[PDB]
Design a protein around this ligand. Structure first.
Ligand SMILES: Nc1ncnc2c1ncn2[C@@H]1O[C@H](C[C@@H](N)CC[C@H](N)C(=O)O)[C@@H](O)[C@H]1O
Ligand SMILES: Nc1ncnc2c1ncn2[C@@H]1O[C@H](C[C@@H](N)CC[C@H](N)C(=O)O)[C@@H](O)[C@H]1O
Ligand SMILES: [Mn+2]
Ligand SMILES: [Mn+2]
Ligand SMILES: [Mn+2]
Ligand code: NA
Ligand code: NA
Lengths: 244, 241
């Protein structure tokens, strides 16, 4: 396989959402992706120990112990074999996931994703064993399982033969253009005429202007980090004066 | 139920990740959350159950056809009953989901989440039927199913009785420690083992402030840093190598 992924989670069977459905399922079948789970409860000191314990200093919730996690990671590294496995902890305190980040992660041989639960995992585990911390965004979820599946799904799309990933939002810093399909007219709304009767340069130009315009209206910060050209400044100026 | 959620998806089986697990599963059981799926493949009139069609203007991929989506939303809106249902489309082109956004969505009685597939859904469906578009972040996924579950999970945490946070009041969370006191030559900070609530309260606030400053200074700029916090953060900064 092109990419080996090992997931450290207390709910391995949640990962059926990506292993049984979509591109990730197809990539596993096609052999582009190997997906494996490692339950920390199977690695406790003895069968009478929980993965979690009480936080030192008080406060709400439970914290995940270092020993169950350290066991699961050791066993997962062993299964990675000769691959250079990057150990990622899914955390709201990590590097914000972006398409550029997804392209970087898609070049790795192996990835060991650590899906936290409760209030989090012990800092000494992160300090010792985690290579990088990643966030899917600025919000708090109950576990790192949906974030790990978000990472895996975004990365898998970029694997050769998995799917257009070179016609997307955040590829050239722009948002995508609108998409239209049959019928030509639906509920008093017709498909733009350029898509129906325009040539491949008219379509290329209308699609670029719509992408520029949508990015300007919704995600202005995206244009600040992406210096527009003279063609684009003209197409966007036209969009602004014509949006109504 | 406190919150009714209807999901329009071609893979309703994927939603077992939230219906069988955690807080969302617990909230369904506790009756705080009603979760339902509406497969557009059931609102199609052919032998192989088609939801996709070819895009106008050319280019790669398929676009999701209106009729299957029209059907599933109509049926979902009927099931919402007398609830004020907000129709959200999960899109990388929508409003970026943040904790403040999660707090706003948690005040709604009903939500109809539209989980797209392929290259997207027809713009005329979004223009006609969708109230707001939401993104989970600046990256592209193959479908709107993981994003819809991300929304539902973040919102459910804020439902009274479902369960301070890393994006609440500006700051990121402090580090967490548990048993043993010493592991592989690494000991838990002494403040945490001491037992003085004010010492712990101030150390924890300082570590949050410090972690936010180091990693997410942007969060701090858009925050009302008190005299207590300015002092604790100044101390965090000056007392590090
Ligand atoms: N936005 C996110 N992106 C990636 N992982 C997340 C995100 N939100 C929550 N998590 C995961 O969910 C786990 C459990 C969370 N309830 C704890 C969050 C923690 N109390 C904090 O505020 O940082 C975390 O340890 C992460 O693994
Ligand atoms: N970051 C995201 N946040 C919310 N939904 C997403 C996100 N990424 C992809 N999607 C969903 O996945 C569907 C299919 C995507 N492959 C299409 C994305 C589209 N080509 C674009 O660049 O905007 C979209 O219609 C959305 O429903
Ligand atoms: Mn596209
Ligand atoms: Mn139109
Ligand atoms: Mn917290
Ligand atoms: Na035609
Ligand atoms: Na705190």
């Amino acid at each position: 396989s092109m990419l080996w992924v090992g997931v450290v989670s207390i709910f391995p069977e949640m990962f059926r959402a990506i292993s049984d459905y979509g591109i990730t399922s197809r990539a596993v079948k096609q052999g582009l992706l190997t997906l494996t789970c490692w339950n920390p409860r199977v690695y406790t000191e003895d069968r009478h120990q929980t993965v979690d314990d009480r936080p030192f200093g008080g406060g709400p919730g439970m914290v995940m112990k270092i020993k169950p996690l350290e066991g699961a990671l050791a066993d997962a590294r062993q299964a990675a074999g000769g691959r250079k496995a990057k150990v990622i902890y899914l955390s709201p305190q990590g590097r914000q996931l972006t398409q550029a980040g997804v392209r970087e992660l898609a070049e790795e041989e192996a990835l060991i994703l650590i899906a936290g639960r409760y209030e989090g995992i012990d800092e000494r585990f992160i300090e010792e064993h985690v290579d990088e911390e990643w966030s899917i965004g600025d919000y708090v979820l109950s576990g790192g399982e949906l974030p790990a599946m978000v990472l895996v799904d975004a990365v898998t799309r970029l694997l050769p033969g998995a799917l257009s990933a070179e016609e997307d939002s955040f590829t050239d810093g722009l948002l995508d253009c609108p998409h239209y399909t049959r019928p030509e007219v639906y509920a008093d709304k017709r498909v733009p005429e350029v898509l129906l009767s325009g040539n491949h340069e008219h379509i290329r130009r209308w699609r670029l202007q719509q992408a520029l315009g949508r990015t300007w209206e919704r995600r202005a910060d995206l244009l600040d980090s992406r210096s527009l050209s003279g063609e684009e400044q003209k197409l966007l100026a036209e969009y602004i004066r014509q949006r109504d």
